[PDB]
Design a protein around this nucleic acid. Structure first.
Ligand SMILES: [Mg+2]
Ligand SMILES: [Mg+2]
Ligand SMILES: [Mg+2]
Ligand SMILES: [Mg+2]
Ligand SMILES: [Mg+2]
Ligand SMILES: [Mg+2]
Ligand SMILES: [Mg+2]
Ligand SMILES: [Mg+2]
Ligand SMILES: [Mg+2]
Ligand SMILES: [Mg+2]
Ligand SMILES: [Mg+2]
Ligand SMILES: [Mg+2]
Ligand SMILES: [Mg+2]
Ligand SMILES: [Mg+2]
Ligand SMILES: [Mg+2]
Ligand SMILES: [Mg+2]
Ligand SMILES: [Mg+2]
Ligand SMILES: [Mg+2]
Ligand SMILES: [Mg+2]
Ligand SMILES: [Mg+2]
Ligand SMILES: [Mg+2]
Ligand SMILES: [Mg+2]
Ligand SMILES: [Mg+2]
Ligand SMILES: [Mg+2]
Ligand SMILES: [Mg+2]
Ligand SMILES: [Mg+2]
Ligand SMILES: [Mg+2]
Ligand SMILES: [Mg+2]
Ligand SMILES: [Mg+2]
Ligand SMILES: [Mg+2]
Ligand SMILES: [Mg+2]
Lengths: 106, 151, 98, 96, 127, 206
RNA sequence: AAGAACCUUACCUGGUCUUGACAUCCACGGAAGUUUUCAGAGAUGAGAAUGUGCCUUCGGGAACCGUGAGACAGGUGCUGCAUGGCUGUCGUCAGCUCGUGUUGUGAAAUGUUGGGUUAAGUCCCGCAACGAGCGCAACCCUUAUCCUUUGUUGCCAGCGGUCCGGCCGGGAACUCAAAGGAGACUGCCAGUGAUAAACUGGAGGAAGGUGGGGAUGACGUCAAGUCAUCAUGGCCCUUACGACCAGGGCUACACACGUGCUACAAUGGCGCAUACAAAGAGAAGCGACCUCGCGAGAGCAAGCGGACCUCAUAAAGUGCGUCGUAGUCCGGAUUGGAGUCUGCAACUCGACUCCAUGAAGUCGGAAUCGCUAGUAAUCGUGGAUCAGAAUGCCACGGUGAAUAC
């Protein structure tokens, strides 16, 4: 995108490459630099991310979830009853979890 | 015709009179791909028509056509599980195309000597509403009236 | 003055062979009058591809014969002496006569 | 293809080039309008295989009589299978 | 001076030369009237000149080979319109609407194997 | 049968010709027959030498004859003994002075012809056909060969009903004209009849 | 089957041969070869002349010919329901699958379904699926425009004079030839579309939306076709199911079907005059010119391995004249006589020429076929096979439509 072949060949092939690139970026982004299976999952919603929870359970990876009243526990190792729709509430969860993980090995 | 509505192919005007309409007529009269023979025949027929009926070539041709142009024709609908023959209005371009075809067909079956005479007789009596082509038009029209119940 | 006509089955091989003759003549003398393509022959064949019946099933082949002519007009001795023994031929035919 | 047939063809070619192409004087030169006598026409006791118009022109490899091509000396099918592998210089699949 | 145009149509190739003189016509060392003057496609050569009025203001000398009457006439017409650029590109605008500059590429189709001629297929029977 | 020869269809685009001499109609047939006569003799004589192909050219009243082989050592014997014998016999058959060249082929398992000869040789030795093909496919992909593809056919394993059971790995774009597809065939002569073998090998796209 | 008088040719009737027509080996004899006579339909038997070419510690030799025994040779004989290879077909239809993941006890499903869109499993978006392969498309050949290079045997615009013929100096313009490049990519504008894919229209352009045509034929189906092109398992015959020869047949003829050519005419027949192509072939070949013949052709004899010479005058067409709707100045079958060639040989059984003869046929029921544009229709030209022989096959151009609501 910056150093290799991005301008050569027709503009049509340039634009398809870019739109294909952003397709990969927004589909699988931060996960790019993982290089292995994780050690834990954090899900904002349980009944909306059931596929991810099920895959984690299949592989024996701990799962921490914010479960709403409509959601289903028993796929989650650590349930957190709380609204998962409100923007203010979800930010609160992400901030608190973000803060506690800022403190790494110290 | 299943999918694409198509445009139209143009033709050159008549060299004598620069009429697309007459060029199509000679082109309909053409057989085996001999345009020179066709244009020769029509020119001989129309000049004979002009001196017969005075006036001029174009209006002599127009009066012949307007007497044989059909306004409505019958068509097979077959929608209700039955053979219905419904009337449908004819388009302008198709209207004159049928006329020219009928005129040529009628002239072809006449019994005069030269085809040029056959056209002259047909185009003349067509202006007088007694040619075979005129008979076909009214035959088509009356069939449409008989089946007017469907529409 | 001296006519050389080359023929072969591929144009990328005829071209270099003639280009070799024209340049050697040009450097060993003057003018060198120029190669000209002139028409090429297309010989077609048609053969039934089945071992039995099936008349409509057949394929068509052709052989293209490319022909070139140089017609050097210089009788220079340094040119005629070097002109022969310059074949570099891998399936290209030569005629020397005028 | 019945190399007994192939034996017959080679024998005819041997006779044809042995007698004719030099006894052609007997046929053409003498049976002419010199201005006759049927003696020359009468002398046609040759083996009857010396006539060049008795060779069937079979395929070199397989030897079938039909589907021959002079340019290649092979039948249609042998031409095809050799062409696709190379062998015949310059042959391609034509289109236009 | 004189202007040139090539023109081509259906196996026919033409050579057209334009001069600013009277309205004389000569085709292949003959007259249009004598070449195809009154026979088929007589005015086809005139069409590029009926628009942008001629009267008697252009000398035309041409030579054509290949094809047949209609082809050679069509080849000429393409030459006339292509060499009629004398009046710069201004007259080309209405020349397009006439539809003359566009070279007509409508060659004859080859005859394929199994077909009788090009697209005509041999008669067929089912039972 | 509804597939074009992948060699012939490429014969002008990417695949070179296998005979590059020129001749007029007068001697075209004679040259062609001589080539065939030469080729069948060499391939029969060098049966154990694993010859990939024979390229014959006749530049300026001669015959070159280049032999592409995977084991030139025994093709040439010691110094030039056996190769001279081939050259002498070839010149006799063709009726003209003859030379002979040897071209070693690297990666013998990447050559379509050689692979087929190996499979048919094993098959005549009563190797189970499934393992012979799988071995050929896998050890070819191991060395480049984007598209190995092999196919046996006809009375497999001494059955009563014939069948094909081909395998492929990689990609083999037979419909792209500039794909460097190396294709060749061979046949075994087992006690149960004839078994045919076809192998396609893909390489760079140009 | 891209071409049965002999041959081809296998098939029939006769005349013949048996390690053989075709191949290797062993032993013996002989150069090989060439010219002639008799009997026979011939194959084959009987003879007569002539030649004796290269090697040789020489039981012998090499290319070649006869004699004897063997292993053998031979089969277009059966089995495409044992096979390879090759081919048709659905169908150039857009589909057919796999790895991992997931769902179901399992056969299996998903992906490959859904909303749009496309010629297309083409693409966009969504989606327990994530990717990939064979297909589609593109890369290949040809055609349509332009530029550069060289200009013959190709070309002749500006110049000089000419037998008015590029013919002649000359020219490198032009047509053209054949190599290398440019070009077309929804690229640019407008509108619609979820603001995506894409669709409709417009400019420019020779060409506009995969510009036209071709090659290209997925996994598989039909125990589809080919043992007779070839190869090949098994079986079968081996003084015969093998081999040679002459003649005959494959060309028969109460009939039934398929594919075609010519017609039934005045958009025409006939006579005279006259204009415009493309693409091919040629050395056992194509065969100018000139003379002879009413003609097919014959005699003499240039040129050409061919942008040079030959095949080779294109015909429809256009001008005049005649025919005047008749079984005709339409139609040409059939038949008698006379000929030209190829061929050892035209009875069975060739093509073509001259004179004479002049059937059916007046547009064809039920039914049914091809074709969407340089297409149908119509008119000519060439090539393979080939001594000789197309109304078939494969190619080329001329004129050139109707209609898709
Ligand atoms: Mg030629
Ligand atoms: Mg055999
Ligand atoms: Mg013959
Ligand atoms: Mg045509
Ligand atoms: Mg195919
Ligand atoms: Mg016989
Ligand atoms: Mg016979
Ligand atoms: Mg017998
Ligand atoms: Mg089968
Ligand atoms: Mg079939
Ligand atoms: Mg499971
Ligand atoms: Mg599917
Ligand atoms: Mg499925
Ligand atoms: Mg869909
Ligand atoms: Mg796809
Ligand atoms: Mg999907
Ligand atoms: Mg002058
Ligand atoms: Mg547009
Ligand atoms: Mg494709
Ligand atoms: Mg069967
Ligand atoms: Mg059968
Ligand atoms: Mg059989
Ligand atoms: Mg028959
Ligand atoms: Mg008559
Ligand atoms: Mg007569
Ligand atoms: Mg009658
Ligand atoms: Mg009548
Ligand atoms: Mg269509
Ligand atoms: Mg025709
Ligand atoms: Mg010929
Ligand atoms: Mg012939």
């Amino acid at each position: 995108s910056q150093d290799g072949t991005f301008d050569k060949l027709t503009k049509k092939e340039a634009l398809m490459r870019t739109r294909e690139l952003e397709k990969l970026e927004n589909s699988l982004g931060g996960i790019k630099d993982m290089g292995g299976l994780p050690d834990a999952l954090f899900v904002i919603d349980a009944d909306h991310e059931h596929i991810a929870i099920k895959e984690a359970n299949n592989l024996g990876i701990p799962v921490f979830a914010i479960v709403d009243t409509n959601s289903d526990p028993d796929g989650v190792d650590f349930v957190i009853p709380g609204n998962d729709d409100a923007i203010r509430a979800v930010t609160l969860y992400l901030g608190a979890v973000a803060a506690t993980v800022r403190e790494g090995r110290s | 015709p299943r999918r694409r509505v198509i445009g139209q192919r143009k033709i050159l005007p008549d060299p004598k009179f620069g009429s697309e309409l007459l060029a199509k007529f000679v082109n309909i009269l053409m057989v085996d791909g001999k345009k020179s023979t066709a244009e020769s025949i029509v020119y001989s027929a129309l000049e004979t028509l002009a001196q017969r009926s005075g006036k001029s070539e174009l209006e002599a041709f127009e009066v012949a056509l307007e007497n044989v142009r059909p306004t409505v024709e019958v068509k097979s609908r077959r929608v209700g599980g039955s053979t219905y023959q419904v009337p449908v209005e004819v388009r302008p371009v198709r209207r004159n195309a049928l006329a020219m075809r009928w005129i040529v067909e009628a002239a072809r079956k006449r019994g005069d000597k030269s085809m040029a005479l056959r056209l002259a007789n047909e185009l003349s009596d067509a202006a007088e509403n007694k040619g075979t082509a005129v008979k076909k038009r009214e035959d088509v029209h009356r069939m449409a009236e008989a089946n007017k119940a469907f529409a | 003055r001296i006519r050389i006509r080359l023929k072969a089955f591929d144009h990328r091989l005829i071209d270099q062979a003639t280009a070799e003759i024209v340049e050697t003549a040009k450097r060993t003398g003057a003018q060198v009058r120029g190669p000209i393509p002139l028409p090429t022959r297309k010989e077609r064949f048609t053969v039934l591809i089945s071992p039995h019946v099936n008349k409509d099933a057949r394929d068509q082949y052709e052989i293209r014969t490319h022909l070139r002519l140089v017609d050097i007009v210089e009788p220079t001795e340094k040119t005629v002496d070097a002109l022969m023994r310059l074949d570099l031929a891998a399936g290209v035919d030569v005629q020397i006569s005028l | 293809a019945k190399q007994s047939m192939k034996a017959r063809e080679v024998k005819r070619v041997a006779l044809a080039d042995k007698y004719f192409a030099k006894r052609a004087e007997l046929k053409a030169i003498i049976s002419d309008v010199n201005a006759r006598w049927n003696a020359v026409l009468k002398l046609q006791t040759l083996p009857r295989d010396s006539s060049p118009s008795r060779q069937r022109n079979r395929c070199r490899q397989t030897g079938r009589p039909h589907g021959f091509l002079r340019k290649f000396g092979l039948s249609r099918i042998k031409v095809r299978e050799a062409a696709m592998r190379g062998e015949i210089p310059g042959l391609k699949k034509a289109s236009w | 001076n004189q202007y040139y145009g090539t023109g081509r149509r259906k196996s026919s190739a033409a050579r057209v030369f334009i001069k600013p003189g009277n309205g004389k016509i000569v085709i292949n060392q003959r007259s249009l009237e004598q070449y195809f003057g009154r026979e088929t496609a007589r005015m086809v050569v005139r069409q590029p000149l009926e628009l942008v009025d001629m009267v008697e203001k252009l000398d035309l000398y041409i030579t054509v080979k290949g094809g047949g009457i209609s082809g050679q006439a069509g080849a000429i017409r393409h030459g006339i319109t292509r060499a009629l650029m004398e009046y710069d590109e201004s007259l080309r605008s209405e020349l397009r609407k006439a539809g003359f500059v566009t070279r007509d590429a409508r060659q004859v189709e080859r005859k394929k194997v199994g077909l009788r001629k090009a697209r005509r297929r041999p008669q067929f029977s089912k039972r | 049968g509804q597939k074009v020869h992948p060699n012939g269809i490429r014969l002008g685009i990417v695949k070179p010709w296998n005979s590059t001499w020129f001749a007029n109609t007068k001697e075209f047939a004679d040259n062609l027959d001589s080539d065939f006569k030469v080729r069948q003799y060499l391939t029969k004589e060098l049966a154990k030498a694993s010859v990939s192909r024979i390229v014959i050219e006749r530049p300026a009243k001669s015959i070159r004859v280049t032999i592409h082989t995977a084991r030139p050592g025994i093709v040439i014997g010691k110094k030039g003994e056996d190769v001279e014998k081939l050259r002498k016999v070839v010149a006799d058959i063709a009726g003209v002075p003859a030379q002979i060249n040897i071209a070693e082929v690297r990666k013998p398992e990447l050559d379509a012809k050689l692979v087929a000869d190996s499979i048919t040789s094993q098959l005549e030795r009563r190797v189970m056909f499934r393992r012979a093909m799988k071995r050929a496919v896998q050890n070819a992909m191991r060395l480049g060969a984007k598209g190995i593809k092999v196919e046996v056919s006809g009375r497999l394993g001494g059955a009563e009903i014939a069948r094909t059971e081909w395998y492929r790995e990689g990609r083999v774009p037979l419909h792209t004209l500039r794909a460097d597809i190396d294709y060749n065939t061979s046949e075994a002569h087992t006690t149960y009849g004839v078994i045919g073998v076809k192998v396609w090998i893909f390489k760079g796209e140009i």
